[PDB]
Design an enzyme around this catalytic site. Structure first.
Site, PDB file in Angstrom:
ATOM      1  N   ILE A 117       4.990  -6.831  -7.546  1.00  0.00           N
ATOM      2  CA  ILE A 117       4.813  -7.886  -6.534  1.00  0.00           C
ATOM      3  C   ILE A 117       3.863  -6.802  -5.144  1.00  0.00           C
ATOM      4  O   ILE A 117       2.401  -8.001  -5.141  1.00  0.00           O
ATOM      5  CB  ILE A 117       6.056  -8.389  -5.606  1.00  0.00           C
ATOM      6  CG1 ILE A 117       6.634  -9.034  -6.155  1.00  0.00           C
ATOM      7  CG2 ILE A 117       5.555  -9.170  -4.392  1.00  0.00           C
ATOM      8  CD1 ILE A 117       8.051 -10.352  -5.882  1.00  0.00           C
ATOM      9  N   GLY A 118       4.458  -5.796  -4.929  1.00  0.00           N
ATOM     10  CA  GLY A 118       3.562  -4.935  -3.842  1.00  0.00           C
ATOM     11  C   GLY A 118       3.195  -3.674  -4.048  1.00  0.00           C
ATOM     12  O   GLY A 118       4.263  -3.425  -4.489  1.00  0.00           O
TER      13      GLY A 118
ATOM     14  N   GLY B 254       2.577   0.048  -2.104  1.00  0.00           N
ATOM     15  CA  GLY B 254       2.462   0.587  -0.606  1.00  0.00           C
ATOM     16  C   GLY B 254       2.529   2.297  -1.118  1.00  0.00           C
ATOM     17  O   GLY B 254       2.578   2.413  -2.121  1.00  0.00           O
TER      18      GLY B 254
ATOM     19  N   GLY C  87       6.209   3.714  -2.047  1.00  0.00           N
ATOM     20  CA  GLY C  87       7.013   2.438  -2.317  1.00  0.00           C
ATOM     21  C   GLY C  87       6.318   1.488  -3.395  1.00  0.00           C
ATOM     22  O   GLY C  87       5.131   1.137  -2.723  1.00  0.00           O
ATOM     23  N   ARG C  88       7.731   1.106  -3.949  1.00  0.00           N
ATOM     24  CA  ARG C  88       6.729  -0.381  -4.219  1.00  0.00           C
ATOM     25  C   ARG C  88       7.896  -1.755  -3.938  1.00  0.00           C
ATOM     26  O   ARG C  88       9.234  -1.121  -3.502  1.00  0.00           O
ATOM     27  CB  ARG C  88       6.485  -0.472  -5.859  1.00  0.00           C
ATOM     28  CG  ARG C  88       5.810   0.943  -6.481  1.00  0.00           C
ATOM     29  CD  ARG C  88       5.555   0.708  -7.855  1.00  0.00           C
ATOM     30  NE  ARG C  88       7.485   0.987  -8.819  1.00  0.00           N
ATOM     31  CZ  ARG C  88       6.909   0.795 -10.494  1.00  0.00           C
ATOM     32  NH1 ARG C  88       5.646   0.885 -11.064  1.00  0.00           N
ATOM     33  NH2 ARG C  88       8.229   1.125 -10.764  1.00  0.00           N
ATOM     34  N   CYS C  89       7.905  -2.554  -4.302  1.00  0.00           N
ATOM     35  CA  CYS C  89       8.374  -4.163  -4.182  1.00  0.00           C
ATOM     36  C   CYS C  89       8.344  -4.902  -5.111  1.00  0.00           C
ATOM     37  O   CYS C  89       7.523  -4.877  -5.900  1.00  0.00           O
ATOM     38  CB  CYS C  89       7.895  -4.778  -3.037  1.00  0.00           C
ATOM     39  SG  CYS C  89       8.264  -6.440  -2.616  1.00  0.00           S
TER      40      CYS C  89
ATOM     41  N   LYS D  67      13.474  -2.782  -3.263  1.00  0.00           N
ATOM     42  CA  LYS D  67      12.500  -2.315  -2.011  1.00  0.00           C
ATOM     43  C   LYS D  67      12.357  -0.815  -3.003  1.00  0.00           C
ATOM     44  O   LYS D  67      13.249  -0.691  -2.596  1.00  0.00           O
ATOM     45  CB  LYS D  67      12.446  -2.226  -1.001  1.00  0.00           C
ATOM     46  CG  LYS D  67      12.327  -3.262   0.044  1.00  0.00           C
ATOM     47  CD  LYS D  67      11.237  -3.752  -0.418  1.00  0.00           C
ATOM     48  CE  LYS D  67      11.498  -5.555  -0.125  1.00  0.00           C
ATOM     49  NZ  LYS D  67       9.938  -5.904  -0.097  1.00  0.00           N
TER      50      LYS D  67
ATOM     51  N   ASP E 244      10.313  -7.863  13.136  1.00  0.00           N
ATOM     52  CA  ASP E 244       8.463  -7.800  14.182  1.00  0.00           C
ATOM     53  C   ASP E 244       8.055  -9.713  13.929  1.00  0.00           C
ATOM     54  O   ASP E 244       8.238 -10.122  13.066  1.00  0.00           O
ATOM     55  CB  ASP E 244       7.640  -6.807  13.821  1.00  0.00           C
TER      56      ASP E 244
HETATM   57  C1  WGZ Z   1       6.668  -4.502   1.487  1.00  0.00           C
HETATM   58  C2  WGZ Z   1       7.382  -6.823   1.550  1.00  0.00           C
HETATM   59  O1  WGZ Z   1       8.098  -6.370   1.989  1.00  0.00           O
HETATM   60  C3  WGZ Z   1       9.213  -7.804   2.169  1.00  0.00           C
HETATM   61  C4  WGZ Z   1       9.155  -8.467   0.475  1.00  0.00           C
HETATM   62  C5  WGZ Z   1      10.149 -10.082   0.369  1.00  0.00           C
HETATM   63  N1  WGZ Z   1       9.920 -10.865  -0.688  1.00  0.00           N
HETATM   64  C6  WGZ Z   1      10.970 -11.495  -0.975  1.00  0.00           C
HETATM   65  N2  WGZ Z   1       9.921 -12.501  -1.455  1.00  0.00           N
HETATM   66  C7  WGZ Z   1       8.718 -12.420  -1.252  1.00  0.00           C
HETATM   67  C8  WGZ Z   1       7.481 -12.646  -2.771  1.00  0.00           C
HETATM   68  C9  WGZ Z   1       5.835 -12.762  -2.423  1.00  0.00           C
HETATM   69  C10 WGZ Z   1       5.831 -11.621  -1.441  1.00  0.00           C
HETATM   70  O2  WGZ Z   1       4.787 -11.041  -1.226  1.00  0.00           O
HETATM   71  C11 WGZ Z   1       3.682 -11.749  -1.385  1.00  0.00           C
HETATM   72  C12 WGZ Z   1       3.403 -11.370  -3.197  1.00  0.00           C
HETATM   73  C13 WGZ Z   1       2.020 -10.913  -3.869  1.00  0.00           C
HETATM   74  N3  WGZ Z   1       0.349 -12.169  -2.468  1.00  0.00           N
HETATM   75  C14 WGZ Z   1      -0.690 -11.324  -3.148  1.00  0.00           C
HETATM   76  C15 WGZ Z   1       1.400 -11.723  -1.043  1.00  0.00           C
HETATM   77  C16 WGZ Z   1       2.177 -12.488  -1.129  1.00  0.00           C
HETATM   78  C17 WGZ Z   1       6.776 -10.789  -0.410  1.00  0.00           C
HETATM   79  C18 WGZ Z   1       7.929 -11.147  -0.830  1.00  0.00           C
HETATM   80  S1  WGZ Z   1      10.541  -9.802   1.932  1.00  0.00           S
HETATM   81  C19 WGZ Z   1       9.660  -8.631   2.564  1.00  0.00           C
HETATM   82  C20 WGZ Z   1      11.101  -7.762   4.210  1.00  0.00           C
HETATM   83  N4  WGZ Z   1      10.296  -6.678   4.428  1.00  0.00           N
HETATM   84  O3  WGZ Z   1      11.653  -7.947   4.425  1.00  0.00           O
HETATM   85  C21 WGZ Z   1       6.064  -7.102   1.836  1.00  0.00           C
HETATM   86  C22 WGZ Z   1       5.271  -7.974   2.547  1.00  0.00           C
HETATM   87  C23 WGZ Z   1       4.457  -8.868   3.273  1.00  0.00           C
HETATM   88  C24 WGZ Z   1       3.431  -8.869   2.648  1.00  0.00           C
HETATM   89  C25 WGZ Z   1       4.484  -8.407   0.771  1.00  0.00           C
HETATM   90  C26 WGZ Z   1       5.346  -7.483   0.687  1.00  0.00           C
HETATM   91  C27 WGZ Z   1       4.931  -6.999  -0.854  1.00  0.00           C
HETATM   92  F1  WGZ Z   1       4.423  -7.342  -1.270  1.00  0.00           F
HETATM   93  F2  WGZ Z   1       4.689  -5.243  -0.731  1.00  0.00           F
HETATM   94  F3  WGZ Z   1       6.211  -7.568  -1.159  1.00  0.00           F
END
Ligand code: WGZ
Ligand code: CL
Ligand code: CL
Ligand code: CL
Length: 258
Positions: free
Chosen positions: A12-13, A15, A18-20, A35, A130
Site C-alpha cells: 500500500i505504501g 517509506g 519499511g512498508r505498509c 507495517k 496526531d
Molecule cells: C504509513 C501508513 O500508516 C497507516 C496505514 C493505515 N491503513 C489501514 N488501512 C489503510 C488503507 C489505505 C491507506 O493508505 C492509502 C493507500 C494509497 N493511497 C494513495 C493513499 C491512501 C492506509 C491504511 S493505518 C496507519 C496508521 N499509522 O495508523 C500510511 C499513513 C497515511 C497514508 C498512507 C499510509 C501507507 F500508505 F503507508 F499505508
C-alpha cells in the site's frame, strides 16, 4: 504469531525504512494491513523503546481508533510486523488532495461525520496520535479512525500548519488539541488550511492575528460557527469535547456504525 499465518496481497505504501502492506489472515480470510519494520540496524535502546511504543498500541481499543491486532517478530530477516485494521477508504489527506485537484468540495454530512468521530477519538485519548489528515482513516462503512502517526514515522522541512497559538509559545493542554481539530475540519471544508505561509515565521504571524476566511458558503452557518470557535486564539474560549458533541448539528447517524 507467525508471518506464515498471513499472506501479503500487495504493498500500500513505502517509506525509507519499511512498508505498509495489505494482507489476508489465513485462518478466516480477514483483510488487515501490516507495517513491516527492519530493526536490524537498531541499538538495544532503540529496540526497547520500540517495544514500549508497540505496547501502547495494544492499550487503546475504540471504534474510532485504528485497531491493533498483532505483532510478529521475524528474527531471521530482523523484521517486525505490526498488524492493524484495514481502512478501505484510505486517509483524509488523500481525500483533500482529491477535492483540491478535482475542484469538488466535500458534503457537509461527511464533515459532520469526521467532526463527531474524531472528537470521540480525541476524548478517548484524553482519558489516556496526531490530528492531521494523513493520520485519519476511513473504513468501508462511513466510519472514521485516528491512526498512530508513530507508524508513519517509523516506516523539520514541513510547515507546522496546525500548531496552536499557545504551543508556539511553550501545549500540554487538551484545548490545544481542539485547535488542531479545528484546523483539520477547516481544511476538509476549505481544501486549504486556515493559515498559510511560506515560512514558519510568516505562519506564526498569521496565527497570532487569528484571522482566516470563512469556510465556503455551501457549509452552514452552524458548521462555520463551531469550526471558528475551535480556532479561537484563547484556549479557554474553544469548546471542550463535551461541548462539541452537544452541538445540534451532531446526530446519531454521524457516529460510528458496525
Ligand atoms: C504509513 C501508513 O500508516 C497507516 C496505514 C493505515 N491503513 C489501514 N488501512 C489503510 C488503507 C489505505 C491507506 O493508505 C492509502 C493507500 C494509497 N493511497 C494513495 C493513499 C491512501 C492506509 C491504511 S493505518 C496507519 C496508521 N499509522 O495508523 C500510511 C499513513 C497515511 C497514508 C498512507 C499510509 C501507507 F500508505 F503507508 F499505508
Ligand atoms: Cl473548489
Ligand atoms: Cl454540503
Ligand atoms: Cl465502528
Amino acid at each position: 504469531s507467525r508471518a506464515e499465518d498471513y499472506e501479503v496481497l500487495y504493498t500500500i505504501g513505502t517509506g525509507s525504512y519499511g512498508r505498509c502492506q495489505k494482507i489476508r489472515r489465513k485462518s478466516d480470510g480477514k483483510i488487515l494491513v501490516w507495517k513491516e519494520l527492519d530493526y536490524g540496524s537498531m541499538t538495544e535502546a532503540e529496540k526497547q523503546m520500540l517495544v514500549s511504543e508497540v505496547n501502547l498500541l495494544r492499550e487503546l481499543k475504540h471504534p474510532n481508533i485504528v485497531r491493533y491486532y498483532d505483532r510478529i517478530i521475524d528474527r531471521t530477516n530482523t523484521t517486525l510486523y505490526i498488524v492493524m485494521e484495514y481502512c478501505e477508504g484510505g486517509d483524509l489527506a488523500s481525500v483533500i488532495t482529491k477535492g483540491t485537484k478535482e475542484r469538488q468540495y466535500l458534503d457537509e454530512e461527511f464533515v459532520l461525520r469526521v467532526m463527531t468521530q474524531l472528537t470521540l477519538a480525541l476524548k478517548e485519548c484524553h482519558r489516556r496520535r496526531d490530528l492531521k489528515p494523513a493520520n485519519v482513516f476511513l473504513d468501508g462503512k462511513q466510519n472514521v479512525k485516528l491512526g498512530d502517526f508513530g507508524l508513519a514515522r517509523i516506516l523539520f522541512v514541513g510547515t507546522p500548519y496546525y500548531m496552536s497559538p499557545e504551543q508556539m509559545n511553550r501545549s500540554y493542554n487538551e484545548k490545544s488539541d481542539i485547535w488542531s481539530l479545528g484546523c483539520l475540519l477547516y481544511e476538509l471544508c476549505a481544501l486549504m488550511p486556515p493559515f498559510t505561509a511560506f515560512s514558519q515565521k510568516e505562519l506564526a504571524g498569521k496565527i497570532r492575528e487569528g484571522k482566516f476566511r470563512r469556510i465556503p458558503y455551501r457549509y452552514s452557518d452552524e458548521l462555520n460557527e463551531i469550526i471558528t470557535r475551535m480556532l479561537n486564539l484563547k484556549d479557554y474560549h474553544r469548546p471542550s469535547v463535551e461541548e462539541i458533541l452537544e452541538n445540534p448539528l451532531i446526530l446519531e447517524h454521524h457516529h460510528h456504525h458496525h
